[PDB]
């Protein structure tokens, strides 16, 4: 858990360097679960790079343990449908007539809830629709096309998806939504539906240190949305200090208070990503090269990671929030 948080922020820094001016949106959990799933059939350097990559201290934790921690969280899909929807999913679309260790097969199905689907990668019109139709079903239609182009020498594709819909404890009234200004820069702006709430008592903290303001808006289930609003020209000062300690200082400093007015855009955004470079910058190299030991899958050192892709979607409206994310690890011959 303290690992997933370190991993989320590491990843945050990386994505921003690549495009410092674009929206960022991702699910750390989806990326982690998919890298851990991959770790089943990985050996030696390959195997140790992914776990230290995911931020785990291998002196401390065993890997049989880490697998149980992922198995434990996934079990909490038990989900109470009391104004809260959740569903995670893992899959492995293996090439028709490729043989896997009984041991691989059993571990995926038992620890990650995975399912094995025989897919014919020579027919890429279809193998393509199959994986896209799988992801679309699970995200209930938000992520319509995770897989774009896909080669015929693709041996196997690992897939993870996460769906979450929730209600605000304090919903917004659509009647108080009016087009207003959203400033991209000090001198440039656009017009966006700006929702509002009045005389509301919620968790608050003004961090003079980082020149930003933090507020918590709760959802009925047991999750919360944390909003940080840096002063104009301080977004970079904040991002520079986005670390586990800082997230803890804010949460511990939050105090109840009555806000006269709160304005929040009603919006809907998504990002698409090729994670090869980012994982490489976090130290996961060998899984991509000729040296890849993924022999826990077949029993032979004949498979390598072609690519890792993620797509995430965030909807903010007056009744609640919807977000989904998907990660796919493309696997080829070595």
């Amino acid at each position: 858990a303290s690992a997933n948080v370190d991993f989320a922020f590491s990843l945050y820094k990386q994505l921003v360097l690549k495009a410092p001016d674009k929206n960022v949106i991702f699910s750390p959990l989806s990326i982690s679960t998919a890298l851990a799933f991959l770790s089943l059939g990985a050996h030696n350097t390959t195997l140790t790079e992914i776990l230290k990559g995911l931020k785990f201290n291998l002196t401390e934790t065993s890997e049989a343990e880490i697998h149980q921690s992922f198995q434990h969280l996934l079990r909490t899909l038990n989900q109470s449908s009391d104004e809260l929807q959740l569903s995670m999913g893992n899959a492995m679309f293996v090439k028709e007539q490729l043989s896997l260790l009984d041991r691989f097969t059993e571990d995926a199905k038992r620890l990650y809830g995975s399912e094995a689907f025989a897919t014919d990668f020579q027919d890429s019109a279809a193998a393509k629709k199959l994986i896209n139709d799988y992801v679309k079903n699970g995200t209930r239609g938000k992520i319509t096309d995770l897989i774009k182009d896909l080669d015929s020498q693709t041996m196997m594709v690992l897939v993870n998806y996460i769906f979450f819909k929730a209600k605000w404890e304090m919903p917004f009234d659509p009647q108080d939504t009016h087009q207003s200004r959203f400033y991209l820069s000090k001198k440039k702006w656009v017009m966006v539906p700006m929702m509002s709430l009045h005389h509301l008592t919620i968790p608050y903290f003004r961090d003079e240190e980082l020149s930003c303001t933090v507020v918590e808006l709760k959802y009925t289930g047991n999750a919360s949305a944390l909003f940080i609003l840096p002063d104009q020209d301080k977004m970079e000062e904040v991002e520079a200090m986005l670390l586990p300690e800082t997230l803890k200082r804010w949460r511990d400093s939050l105090e109840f208070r009555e806000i006269g007015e709160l304005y929040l855009p009603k919006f809907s955004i998504s990002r698409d990503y090729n994670l090869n470079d980012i994982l490489l910058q976090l130290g996961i190299e060998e899984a991509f090269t000729s040296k890849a030991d993924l022999s826990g899958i077949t029993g032979a050192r004949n498979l390598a990671v072609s690519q890792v892709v993620h797509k995430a979607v965030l909807d903010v409206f007056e009744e609640g929030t919807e977000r989904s994310a998907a990660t796919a690890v493309k696997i080829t011959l070595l």
Binding site: V5, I269, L314
Partner: protein, 32 residues
């Protein structure tokens, strides 16, 4: 008396209520 208005770039971190974790992470530079 204190107003809080998101009319410039911001961060949105989705977390558990009684647990230190990150489920979802995000920066909105442009809502459109």
């Amino acid at each position: 008396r204190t107003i809080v208005r998101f009319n410039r770039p911001f961060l949105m971190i989705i977390v558990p209520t009684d647990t230190q974790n990150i489920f979802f992470m995000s920066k909105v530079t442009n809502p459109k």
